[PDB]
Coordinates of C-alpha atoms in Angstrom, one line a residue:
Chain O
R9 CA -3.5 28.2 -6.5
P10 CA -5.7 27.9 -9.6
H11 CA -7.5 24.8 -8.8
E12 CA -8.9 26.5 -5.9
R13 CA -11.1 28.6 -8.2
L14 CA -12.7 25.4 -9.8
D15 CA -16.3 24.5 -8.7
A16 CA -15.3 20.9 -9.3
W17 CA -12.7 21.3 -6.7
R18 CA -14.7 23.2 -4.4
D19 CA -17.6 20.9 -4.5
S20 CA -15.4 17.9 -4.4
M21 CA -13.6 19.2 -1.2
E22 CA -16.9 19.6 0.4
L23 CA -17.5 15.9 -0.5
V24 CA -14.5 14.9 1.2
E25 CA -15.5 17.0 4.2
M26 CA -18.8 14.9 4.3
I27 CA -17.1 11.4 4.1
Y28 CA -14.8 11.9 7.2
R29 CA -17.9 13.1 8.9
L30 CA -20.0 10.2 7.7
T31 CA -16.9 7.7 8.8
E32 CA -16.9 9.1 12.3
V33 CA -20.1 7.1 13.5
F34 CA -19.1 3.9 11.7
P35 CA -18.2 0.9 13.8
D36 CA -14.4 1.2 15.5
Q37 CA -13.8 -2.3 13.8
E38 CA -14.0 -0.7 10.7
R39 CA -11.5 2.2 11.2
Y40 CA -8.9 1.1 8.8
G41 CA -11.3 -1.0 6.6
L42 CA -13.9 0.8 4.6
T43 CA -13.4 4.0 6.8
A44 CA -9.7 4.1 5.3
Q45 CA -10.9 3.1 2.0
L46 CA -13.7 5.7 1.8
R47 CA -11.5 8.3 2.9
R48 CA -8.4 7.4 0.3
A49 CA -11.0 7.2 -2.5
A50 CA -12.4 10.8 -1.3
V51 CA -9.0 12.7 -0.9
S52 CA -7.9 11.1 -4.5
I53 CA -10.6 13.2 -6.2
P54 CA -9.7 16.8 -5.1
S55 CA -6.2 16.1 -5.0
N56 CA -6.2 14.9 -8.7
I57 CA -7.9 17.7 -10.0
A58 CA -5.3 20.0 -8.0
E59 CA -2.6 18.2 -10.0
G60 CA -4.3 18.3 -13.3
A61 CA -4.8 22.6 -12.8
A62 CA -0.9 22.5 -12.4
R63 CA -0.3 21.9 -16.1
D68 CA -2.2 15.5 -19.4
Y69 CA -4.4 17.9 -17.5
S70 CA -7.3 15.5 -19.0
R71 CA -5.7 12.2 -17.6
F72 CA -5.6 13.8 -13.8
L73 CA -9.2 14.5 -14.0
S74 CA -9.9 11.1 -15.7
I75 CA -8.3 9.7 -12.4
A76 CA -10.4 11.7 -10.2
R77 CA -13.5 10.4 -11.9
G78 CA -12.5 7.1 -11.3
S79 CA -11.9 7.8 -7.7
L80 CA -15.5 9.2 -7.8
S81 CA -17.0 5.9 -8.8
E82 CA -14.5 4.1 -6.4
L83 CA -16.0 6.2 -3.6
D84 CA -19.5 5.8 -4.8
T85 CA -19.2 2.0 -4.7
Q86 CA -17.9 1.9 -1.3
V87 CA -20.5 4.5 -0.3
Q88 CA -23.3 1.8 -1.4
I89 CA -21.7 -0.9 0.5
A90 CA -21.5 1.3 3.5
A91 CA -25.3 1.6 2.9
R92 CA -25.8 -2.1 2.4
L93 CA -23.7 -3.1 5.8
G94 CA -26.0 -0.6 7.8
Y95 CA -23.0 1.7 8.6
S96 CA -25.0 5.0 7.1
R97 CA -28.7 6.0 7.7
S98 CA -30.5 6.9 4.9
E99 CA -30.8 10.9 5.3
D100 CA -27.0 10.6 5.4
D101 CA -26.9 8.2 2.2
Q102 CA -28.7 10.3 0.4
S103 CA -26.9 13.6 1.1
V104 CA -23.5 11.8 0.1
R105 CA -25.0 10.5 -3.1
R106 CA -26.5 14.0 -4.4
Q107 CA -23.0 15.4 -3.6
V108 CA -21.5 12.6 -5.6
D109 CA -23.7 13.5 -8.7
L110 CA -22.9 17.2 -8.0
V111 CA -19.3 16.5 -8.3
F112 CA -20.0 14.4 -11.3
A113 CA -21.7 17.0 -13.2
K114 CA -19.1 19.7 -12.6
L115 CA -16.0 17.2 -13.2
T116 CA -17.2 16.0 -16.8
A117 CA -18.2 19.6 -17.9
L118 CA -14.7 20.4 -16.8
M119 CA -13.4 17.4 -18.7
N120 CA -15.5 18.3 -21.6
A121 CA -14.4 21.8 -21.9
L122 CA -10.8 20.8 -21.4
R123 CA -11.1 18.4 -24.7
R124 CA -12.7 20.8 -26.7
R125 CA -9.7 23.0 -25.7
Chain M
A7 CA -22.7 10.1 -11.6
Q8 CA -23.0 8.0 -14.6
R9 CA -22.8 4.3 -13.2
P10 CA -22.0 1.9 -16.2
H11 CA -20.4 -0.3 -13.9
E12 CA -23.5 -0.9 -12.1
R13 CA -24.9 -2.7 -14.9
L14 CA -22.2 -5.4 -15.1
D15 CA -22.4 -9.1 -13.7
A16 CA -19.1 -8.9 -12.3
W17 CA -20.0 -5.6 -10.3
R18 CA -23.2 -7.0 -8.9
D19 CA -21.9 -10.5 -8.1
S20 CA -18.5 -8.7 -6.6
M21 CA -20.9 -6.5 -4.3
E22 CA -22.6 -9.7 -3.1
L23 CA -19.2 -11.1 -2.1
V24 CA -18.7 -8.3 -0.1
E25 CA -21.2 -8.8 1.9
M26 CA -21.0 -12.5 2.4
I27 CA -17.2 -11.9 3.5
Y28 CA -18.3 -9.4 6.0
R29 CA -21.0 -12.0 7.1
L30 CA -18.3 -14.9 7.2
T31 CA -15.9 -12.9 9.0
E32 CA -17.9 -11.7 11.8
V33 CA -17.3 -14.8 13.6
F34 CA -13.6 -14.6 13.4
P35 CA -11.6 -14.5 16.4
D36 CA -11.0 -11.0 18.2
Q37 CA -7.2 -11.5 17.7
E38 CA -8.0 -11.4 13.9
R39 CA -10.0 -8.2 13.8
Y40 CA -7.2 -6.1 12.4
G41 CA -5.5 -8.9 11.2
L42 CA -6.9 -11.6 8.7
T43 CA -10.6 -9.9 9.2
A44 CA -9.6 -6.5 8.0
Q45 CA -7.7 -8.3 5.0
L46 CA -10.2 -10.1 3.9
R47 CA -12.8 -7.2 4.1
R48 CA -10.6 -4.8 2.4
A49 CA -9.8 -7.1 -0.5
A50 CA -13.3 -8.2 -1.1
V51 CA -14.3 -4.1 -1.1
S52 CA -11.3 -3.7 -3.4
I53 CA -12.8 -5.4 -6.1
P54 CA -16.4 -3.9 -7.0
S55 CA -14.1 -0.5 -6.3
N56 CA -11.6 -1.5 -9.0
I57 CA -14.5 -2.6 -11.5
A58 CA -16.2 0.6 -11.0
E59 CA -12.7 2.5 -11.2
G60 CA -11.9 0.9 -14.5
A61 CA -15.3 1.6 -15.9
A62 CA -14.9 5.2 -15.4
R63 CA -11.5 5.1 -17.5
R64 CA -11.2 6.8 -20.9
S65 CA -9.4 4.0 -22.8
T66 CA -9.7 0.1 -23.1
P67 CA -5.9 -0.3 -21.8
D68 CA -6.9 1.5 -18.6
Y69 CA -10.3 -0.5 -18.0
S70 CA -8.2 -3.6 -18.5
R71 CA -5.6 -2.6 -16.1
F72 CA -8.2 -1.8 -13.4
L73 CA -10.0 -5.0 -14.0
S74 CA -6.7 -7.2 -13.8
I75 CA -6.0 -5.4 -10.4
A76 CA -9.5 -6.5 -9.2
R77 CA -8.8 -10.3 -10.3
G78 CA -5.8 -10.1 -8.1
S79 CA -7.6 -8.8 -5.1
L80 CA -10.2 -11.7 -5.7
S81 CA -7.1 -14.0 -5.8
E82 CA -5.7 -12.9 -2.4
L83 CA -9.4 -13.2 -1.0
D84 CA -9.8 -16.7 -2.2
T85 CA -6.3 -17.4 -0.7
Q86 CA -7.4 -15.8 2.7
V87 CA -10.9 -17.7 2.7
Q88 CA -8.8 -21.0 2.5
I89 CA -6.4 -20.0 5.2
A90 CA -9.2 -19.1 7.6
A91 CA -10.9 -22.4 6.9
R92 CA -7.4 -24.3 7.6
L93 CA -7.1 -22.5 11.1
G94 CA -10.6 -23.3 11.9
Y95 CA -12.0 -19.8 11.8
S96 CA -14.7 -20.3 9.3
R97 CA -18.0 -22.6 9.8
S98 CA -17.7 -25.1 6.7
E99 CA -21.0 -24.5 5.4
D100 CA -20.4 -20.6 4.5
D101 CA -16.9 -21.4 3.8
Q102 CA -18.6 -23.4 0.8
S103 CA -20.9 -20.5 0.0
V104 CA -18.0 -18.0 -0.6
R105 CA -16.1 -20.5 -2.8
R106 CA -18.9 -20.8 -5.1
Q107 CA -19.4 -17.0 -5.4
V108 CA -15.3 -16.7 -5.8
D109 CA -15.4 -18.7 -8.8
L110 CA -18.6 -16.7 -10.3
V111 CA -17.0 -13.4 -9.9
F112 CA -14.0 -15.1 -11.4
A113 CA -16.0 -16.0 -14.2
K114 CA -17.6 -13.0 -14.9
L115 CA -14.5 -10.8 -14.4
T116 CA -12.3 -13.3 -16.6
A117 CA -15.3 -12.9 -19.4
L118 CA -15.0 -9.3 -19.2
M119 CA -11.2 -9.0 -19.5
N120 CA -11.7 -10.8 -22.7
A121 CA -14.4 -8.7 -24.0
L122 CA -11.9 -5.8 -24.2
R123 CA -9.7 -8.3 -26.0
Chain H
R9 CA -8.7 -24.0 -10.5
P10 CA -5.9 -25.3 -12.2
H11 CA -3.1 -23.9 -9.8
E12 CA -4.3 -26.4 -6.8
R13 CA -2.3 -29.3 -8.8
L14 CA 0.8 -27.3 -8.3
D15 CA 3.3 -28.4 -5.7
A16 CA 4.5 -24.6 -5.6
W17 CA 0.7 -23.4 -4.5
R18 CA 0.2 -26.5 -2.3
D19 CA 3.7 -26.0 -0.7
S20 CA 3.1 -22.2 -0.7
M21 CA -0.2 -22.5 1.4
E22 CA 1.8 -25.4 3.7
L23 CA 4.2 -22.4 4.6
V24 CA 1.4 -19.8 5.2
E25 CA 0.3 -22.3 7.9
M26 CA 3.9 -22.6 9.1
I27 CA 4.2 -18.7 9.4
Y28 CA 1.0 -18.5 11.4
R29 CA 2.3 -21.0 13.9
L30 CA 5.6 -19.3 13.8
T31 CA 4.0 -15.9 14.6
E32 CA 1.6 -16.8 17.1
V33 CA 4.3 -16.6 19.8
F34 CA 5.9 -13.3 18.7
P35 CA 5.7 -10.4 21.0
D36 CA 2.3 -8.7 21.6
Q37 CA 3.7 -5.3 20.6
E38 CA 4.9 -6.9 17.1
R39 CA 1.2 -7.9 16.0
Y40 CA 0.8 -5.3 13.5
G41 CA 3.7 -5.4 13.5
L42 CA 6.7 -8.0 12.3
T43 CA 3.8 -10.9 12.4
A44 CA 1.3 -8.8 10.2
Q45 CA 4.1 -8.3 7.6
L46 CA 5.3 -12.0 7.9
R47 CA 1.6 -12.8 7.4
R48 CA 1.0 -10.8 4.5
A49 CA 4.2 -11.6 2.5
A50 CA 3.1 -15.5 3.0
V51 CA -0.3 -14.9 1.9
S52 CA 1.0 -13.3 -1.1
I53 CA 3.0 -16.3 -2.5
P54 CA 0.1 -18.5 -3.2
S55 CA -2.2 -15.7 -4.3
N56 CA 0.3 -14.5 -6.9
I57 CA 0.8 -18.3 -8.0
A58 CA -3.0 -18.5 -8.2
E59 CA -3.1 -15.1 -10.5
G60 CA -0.2 -16.7 -12.5
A61 CA -1.8 -19.9 -13.3
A62 CA -4.8 -18.4 -14.6
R63 CA -3.0 -16.8 -17.3
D68 CA 2.3 -12.8 -17.7
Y69 CA 2.2 -15.8 -15.9
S70 CA 6.1 -15.8 -15.5
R71 CA 5.8 -12.4 -14.1
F72 CA 3.4 -13.0 -11.4
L73 CA 5.7 -15.9 -10.3
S74 CA 8.4 -13.5 -10.2
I75 CA 6.2 -11.2 -7.7
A76 CA 5.5 -14.6 -5.8
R77 CA 9.3 -15.3 -5.5
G78 CA 9.6 -11.5 -4.7
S79 CA 7.3 -11.9 -1.4
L80 CA 9.5 -15.2 -0.5
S81 CA 12.5 -13.1 -0.5
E82 CA 10.7 -10.6 1.6
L83 CA 9.2 -13.6 3.8
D84 CA 12.9 -15.1 4.3
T85 CA 14.5 -12.0 5.2
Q86 CA 11.8 -11.3 8.0
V87 CA 12.0 -14.9 9.3
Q88 CA 15.7 -14.3 9.4
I89 CA 15.5 -11.2 11.1
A90 CA 12.9 -12.7 13.6
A91 CA 15.4 -15.0 14.8
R92 CA 18.0 -12.7 15.2
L93 CA 15.8 -10.7 17.5
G94 CA 15.2 -13.9 19.3
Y95 CA 11.2 -14.0 18.7
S96 CA 11.3 -17.6 17.2
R97 CA 11.8 -21.1 18.8
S98 CA 15.3 -22.1 17.4
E99 CA 13.6 -25.4 15.9
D100 CA 10.8 -23.7 14.4
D101 CA 13.1 -21.4 12.5
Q102 CA 14.8 -24.2 10.6
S103 CA 11.5 -26.0 9.8
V104 CA 10.4 -22.6 8.1
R105 CA 13.9 -22.2 6.2
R106 CA 13.4 -25.9 4.9
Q107 CA 10.2 -25.0 3.6
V108 CA 11.2 -21.6 2.2
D109 CA 14.0 -23.5 0.4
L110 CA 11.1 -26.1 -1.0
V111 CA 8.9 -23.4 -2.0
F112 CA 11.9 -21.6 -3.7
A113 CA 12.8 -24.7 -5.7
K114 CA 9.2 -25.5 -7.1
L115 CA 8.8 -21.7 -7.9
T116 CA 12.0 -21.8 -9.9
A117 CA 11.0 -25.2 -11.3
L118 CA 7.8 -24.1 -12.7
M119 CA 9.1 -20.6 -13.7
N120 CA 11.7 -22.4 -15.9
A121 CA 9.6 -24.2 -18.1
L122 CA 8.9 -20.8 -19.8
Chain I
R9 CA 22.1 -19.3 0.0
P10 CA 24.4 -18.3 -3.0
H11 CA 23.6 -14.7 -2.0
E12 CA 24.3 -15.3 1.7
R13 CA 28.1 -15.4 0.9
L14 CA 28.0 -11.8 -0.7
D15 CA 29.1 -8.9 1.7
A16 CA 26.5 -6.7 0.7
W17 CA 23.9 -8.8 1.5
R18 CA 25.3 -9.7 5.0
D19 CA 26.2 -6.1 5.6
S20 CA 22.3 -5.4 4.8
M21 CA 21.1 -8.1 7.0
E22 CA 23.0 -6.1 9.9
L23 CA 21.7 -3.0 8.9
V24 CA 18.0 -4.3 8.9
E25 CA 18.6 -5.9 12.3
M26 CA 20.2 -2.4 13.6
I27 CA 16.7 -0.9 12.0
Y28 CA 14.2 -2.9 13.7
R29 CA 16.3 -2.5 17.1
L30 CA 16.6 1.4 16.3
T31 CA 12.8 1.6 16.0
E32 CA 12.1 -0.2 19.4
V33 CA 12.2 3.1 21.4
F34 CA 9.9 5.1 19.1
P35 CA 6.7 6.2 20.3
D36 CA 4.3 2.9 20.3
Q37 CA 2.1 5.1 18.5
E38 CA 4.3 6.0 15.4
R39 CA 4.2 1.7 14.8
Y40 CA 2.4 2.4 11.7
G41 CA 4.3 5.0 11.3
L42 CA 7.8 6.0 10.1
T43 CA 8.4 2.4 12.1
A44 CA 6.7 0.7 9.5
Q45 CA 8.3 2.6 6.7
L46 CA 11.7 2.5 8.1
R47 CA 11.3 -1.4 8.4
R48 CA 9.7 -1.8 4.6
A49 CA 12.5 0.2 3.4
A50 CA 15.2 -1.7 5.2
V51 CA 13.7 -5.4 4.6
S52 CA 13.8 -4.5 0.6
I53 CA 17.4 -4.1 0.2
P54 CA 18.6 -7.8 1.4
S55 CA 15.2 -9.0 -0.3
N56 CA 16.2 -7.5 -3.7
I57 CA 19.9 -8.7 -3.5
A58 CA 18.7 -12.3 -2.8
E59 CA 16.3 -11.9 -5.8
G60 CA 18.8 -10.4 -8.2
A61 CA 21.3 -13.3 -7.4
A62 CA 18.7 -16.1 -8.3
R63 CA 18.2 -14.4 -11.7
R64 CA 20.2 -16.0 -14.7
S65 CA 20.1 -12.4 -16.4
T66 CA 23.1 -10.2 -15.4
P67 CA 21.2 -6.9 -16.2
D68 CA 18.3 -8.0 -14.5
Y69 CA 20.5 -8.8 -11.8
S70 CA 21.8 -5.4 -11.9
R71 CA 18.3 -4.0 -12.2
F72 CA 17.5 -5.6 -8.9
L73 CA 20.7 -4.1 -7.4
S74 CA 19.5 -0.7 -8.1
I75 CA 16.2 -1.0 -6.5
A76 CA 18.3 -2.2 -3.5
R77 CA 20.1 0.9 -3.8
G78 CA 16.8 3.2 -4.1
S79 CA 15.7 1.4 -1.1
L80 CA 18.8 2.1 0.9
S81 CA 18.6 5.7 -0.2
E82 CA 14.8 5.7 1.0
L83 CA 16.0 4.3 4.5
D84 CA 18.6 6.7 5.0
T85 CA 16.3 9.6 4.4
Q86 CA 13.8 8.1 6.8
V87 CA 16.5 7.5 9.4
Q88 CA 17.3 11.4 9.1
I89 CA 13.8 12.0 9.7
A90 CA 13.4 9.8 12.7
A91 CA 16.6 12.1 14.1
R92 CA 15.2 15.3 13.3
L93 CA 12.0 14.3 15.3
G94 CA 13.9 13.1 18.3
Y95 CA 12.9 9.7 18.1
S96 CA 16.5 8.1 18.2
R97 CA 19.4 8.2 20.4
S98 CA 22.2 10.0 18.9
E99 CA 24.6 7.1 19.1
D100 CA 22.2 4.9 17.5
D101 CA 21.7 7.5 14.7
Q102 CA 25.4 7.5 14.1
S103 CA 25.7 3.7 14.3
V104 CA 23.2 3.5 11.6
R105 CA 24.5 6.0 9.5
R106 CA 27.7 4.4 9.5
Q107 CA 26.2 0.9 8.4
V108 CA 24.4 3.0 5.8
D109 CA 27.6 4.1 4.4
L110 CA 29.0 0.5 4.5
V111 CA 26.2 -0.9 2.9
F112 CA 26.4 1.7 0.0
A113 CA 30.0 0.7 -0.5
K114 CA 29.4 -2.8 -0.7
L115 CA 26.4 -2.7 -3.2
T116 CA 28.4 0.0 -5.7
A117 CA 31.3 -2.6 -5.5
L118 CA 29.1 -5.3 -6.4
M119 CA 27.0 -3.4 -9.0
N120 CA 30.3 -2.4 -10.8
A121 CA 31.7 -6.0 -10.1
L122 CA 29.3 -6.8 -13.1
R123 CA 30.0 -3.5 -15.2
Chain A
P10 CA 23.6 13.3 -3.1
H11 CA 19.8 14.4 -3.6
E12 CA 20.8 16.1 -0.3
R13 CA 21.7 19.0 -1.9
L14 CA 18.3 19.5 -4.0
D15 CA 15.9 22.3 -2.8
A16 CA 12.8 19.8 -3.1
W17 CA 14.6 17.4 -0.9
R18 CA 15.6 19.9 1.8
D19 CA 12.3 21.9 1.5
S20 CA 10.4 18.3 1.9
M21 CA 12.3 17.5 5.0
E22 CA 11.2 20.7 6.7
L23 CA 7.6 20.2 5.8
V24 CA 8.0 16.4 7.2
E25 CA 8.4 18.3 10.8
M26 CA 6.1 21.1 9.9
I27 CA 3.4 18.0 9.5
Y28 CA 4.6 16.1 12.5
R29 CA 4.3 19.3 14.8
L30 CA 1.0 20.2 13.3
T31 CA -0.5 16.5 13.8
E32 CA 1.0 16.3 17.5
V33 CA -2.4 18.2 18.6
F34 CA -4.9 16.4 16.6
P35 CA -7.4 14.4 18.5
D36 CA -6.2 11.1 19.7
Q37 CA -9.1 9.2 18.2
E38 CA -7.3 10.2 15.0
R39 CA -4.1 8.8 15.7
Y40 CA -4.1 5.8 13.2
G41 CA -6.0 8.0 11.7
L42 CA -6.1 11.0 9.7
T43 CA -3.0 12.1 11.7
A44 CA -1.0 8.9 10.4
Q45 CA -1.9 9.1 6.9
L46 CA -0.8 12.9 6.9
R47 CA 2.5 12.1 8.2
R48 CA 2.8 8.9 6.1
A49 CA 2.2 11.0 3.2
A50 CA 4.9 13.5 4.3
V51 CA 7.7 11.3 4.6
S52 CA 7.0 9.7 1.5
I53 CA 7.8 12.7 -0.4
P54 CA 11.5 13.2 0.5
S55 CA 11.7 9.5 0.5
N56 CA 10.6 9.3 -3.0
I57 CA 12.8 11.9 -4.2
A58 CA 16.0 10.3 -2.7
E59 CA 15.0 6.9 -4.2
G60 CA 14.2 8.3 -7.5
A61 CA 17.8 10.2 -7.3
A62 CA 19.8 7.1 -6.3
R63 CA 18.4 5.1 -9.3
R64 CA 20.8 5.5 -12.3
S65 CA 18.1 6.0 -14.9
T66 CA 16.3 9.3 -15.8
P67 CA 12.9 7.6 -16.6
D68 CA 12.6 6.3 -13.0
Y69 CA 13.7 9.5 -11.5
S70 CA 10.9 11.1 -13.3
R71 CA 8.6 8.5 -12.2
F72 CA 9.4 8.9 -8.4
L73 CA 9.1 12.6 -8.6
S74 CA 5.6 12.1 -10.1
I75 CA 4.4 10.0 -7.2
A76 CA 6.2 12.4 -4.6
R77 CA 3.9 15.2 -6.1
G78 CA 1.0 12.8 -5.9
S79 CA 1.4 12.5 -2.1
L80 CA 2.0 16.2 -1.9
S81 CA -1.3 16.9 -3.4
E82 CA -3.1 14.4 -1.1
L83 CA -1.3 15.8 1.9
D84 CA -2.5 19.3 0.9
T85 CA -6.0 18.3 0.6
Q86 CA -5.9 16.4 3.6
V87 CA -4.3 19.7 5.7
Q88 CA -7.2 21.6 4.7
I89 CA -9.7 18.9 5.6
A90 CA -8.2 19.1 9.0
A91 CA -8.6 22.9 8.9
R92 CA -12.3 22.4 8.2
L93 CA -12.9 19.9 11.1
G94 CA -11.3 22.3 13.5
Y95 CA -7.9 20.5 14.0
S96 CA -5.6 23.2 13.7
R97 CA -4.8 26.9 14.5
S98 CA -5.0 29.4 11.6
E99 CA -1.9 30.5 11.8
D100 CA -0.2 27.0 11.8
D101 CA -2.3 26.2 8.8
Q102 CA -0.9 29.1 6.8
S103 CA 2.7 28.3 7.5
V104 CA 2.4 24.7 5.8
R105 CA 0.3 26.0 3.1
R106 CA 3.3 28.2 2.3
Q107 CA 5.6 25.2 2.8
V108 CA 3.5 23.1 0.1
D109 CA 3.8 25.9 -2.5
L110 CA 7.5 26.1 -1.8
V111 CA 7.9 22.1 -2.2
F112 CA 5.4 22.3 -5.1
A113 CA 7.8 24.7 -7.2
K114 CA 10.9 23.0 -6.3
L115 CA 9.3 20.0 -7.3
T116 CA 7.9 21.1 -10.6
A117 CA 11.4 22.5 -11.3
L118 CA 13.2 19.4 -10.9
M119 CA 10.5 17.4 -13.1
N120 CA 11.3 20.1 -15.9
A121 CA 15.1 19.2 -16.1

């Protein structure tokens, strides 16, 4: 499995775990709303990277980077709605920034070839 | 990240819509919590998420494809808001606030989809 | 908001309400469910007509007619399963038919 | 409605009713679910037949008829999944398979009937 | 028809594997990580079958790509379930090996 060696994949998978653990203490009203949306956005990041590294490769990473942004927007909504405490909001934000850096450095090296 | 979307009026206004829709829907009947309520929330959330997703894309055609998906979600959001008001789930006053926000978010999105041509 | 002047949207939304009434007495176990799917299909009709009038137009109308065909079959399954009042079914049928005509009318001035 | 006189639609509708009734013995927790997947696939078949028949365009009609047939094929796989998972009664699995073969033939004859 | 394809046959076995794996997941995840995982696996042979029953080759390729998307989403979902503690190691390995199998068979269809 080639993607499994990528920093971008490893750091994005760690992010996904953080999301699932964040959404556990969310209201139960929200299980199929924001929490299902956060989880679908997060899962899409490593999934798409993994798909890319099976190859066009750039297009898959572009999709992953869009999902990152969707996640980041939905994390902010969580914060604003009072579903997350600062300490956890900050942990996820930093991790999102980390995934962004690793993913664009990977996208950039692919474009240069 | 880099968050160019955070700069757009369409996004800031969308994000405000999310909070309003969440507010408005807290008073909806329990029988709708996973029905209409969950649908209004998802659709409202879907809008800024889709703006952000598009803005992160490489080409103009992709940006627009996602902005177009965002306006679609606004259109279903508005339909559901109106239906909730007809079934009498919403109080008339904040039902009016939501509608102005809907027109606004629509304007900002529309203007933007046209900046991309 | 040009769509609100259209007979098709007006009658769409009237159908959405008819579909809510029709399904409020559907079995509880079907709440998420046949009742949910019928409610989403309905909402889809006016939503797509709205998205249409703001513009491609012809294509959103085609999507609206799509959901109406899905609605119509689900309403008919519901009757066959015995979920709907025998007279409420025929009222919905007639409304489906009206929406269909109005959608087809507006879709034809293409 | 005009489409309600097509056998392919009538036999589709009977199939969809069979599928709703088939899922009513599935675990309550699979409601969202193979149960939802089966039903979505099923509903799609007569819905697309009816939509094709309303189009003036014959090739667009045929296209809709292809979608219906893709959905039927989707349905058949999902019915085989339900059986593999022990969700359905043998006889019901058998009744549904036979209805599926019947709708395949009827849809295919209709597709051909417009070359 | 598509039932003579290996990607289908092997997809179908993965579905049974994923249903069994999630049988022991926490009830609190029923609707859930469990449902999203089951929904993803079901979709793989479904899309193969739906694409294959389409006359057109463009549409066949488009369905096989969705199938592969869902396969990636399932794969990451399985590993997240592992990290959360929801599965036995032996069980996790078998599905991993099966995912590898469906992937190679899918890729060998998307090449024809």
